[PDB]
Amino acid sequence: LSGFTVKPVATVYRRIPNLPDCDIDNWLNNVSVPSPLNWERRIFSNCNF
Amino acid sequence: TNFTIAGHEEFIQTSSPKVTIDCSAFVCSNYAACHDLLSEYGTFCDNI
Numbered sequence: 546l547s548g549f550t551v552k553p554v555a556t557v558y559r560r561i562p563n564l565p566d567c568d569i570d571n572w573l574n575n576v577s578v579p580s581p582l583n584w585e586r587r588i589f590s591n592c593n594f
Numbered sequence: 595t596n597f598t599i600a601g602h603e604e605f606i607q608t609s610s611p612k613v614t615i616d617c618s619a620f621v622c623s624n625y626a627a628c629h630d631l632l633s634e635y636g637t638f639c640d641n642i
């Protein structure tokens with residue numbers, strides 16, 4: 546017959562708590578909009594969004 | 595004028611390991627979309 550697989554009995558969830566926010570809205574809604582000639586870039590890491 | 599007796603050895607292959615392949619489980623793991631797509635192919639696994 547066809548194969549089978551043992552069904553899971555629980556679920557493991559591990560993540561690092563107590564991390565700051567990314568605050569992408571403050572970067573997108575700034576009062577300083579650049580031009581395509583001098584476009585800007587900001588790296589978001591180690592944050593929640 | 596004088597003789598002796600020598601002993602040789604010879605091995606002839608007769609059998610072979612009986613390999614069985616679960617074609618469905620090999621092509622697709624325990625995923626629903628993979629099996630749903632494989633069911634629309636035909637009897638390739640059956641022929642194997």
Ligand SMILES: *[C@@H]1O[C@H](CO)[C@@H](O[C@@H]2O[C@H](CO)[C@@H](O)[C@H](O)[C@H]2NC(C)=O)[C@H](O)[C@H]1NC(C)=O
Pocket residue numbers: 571572575576577
């Ligand atoms: C909006 O853009 C301005 C101008 O780029 C930002 O002001 C600068 O912020 C950086 C830090 O990201 C500082 O190092 C500079 O000294 C600031 N320049 C100033 C105050 O003239 C500002 O942070 C951006 N965000 C907001 C919410 O205003």
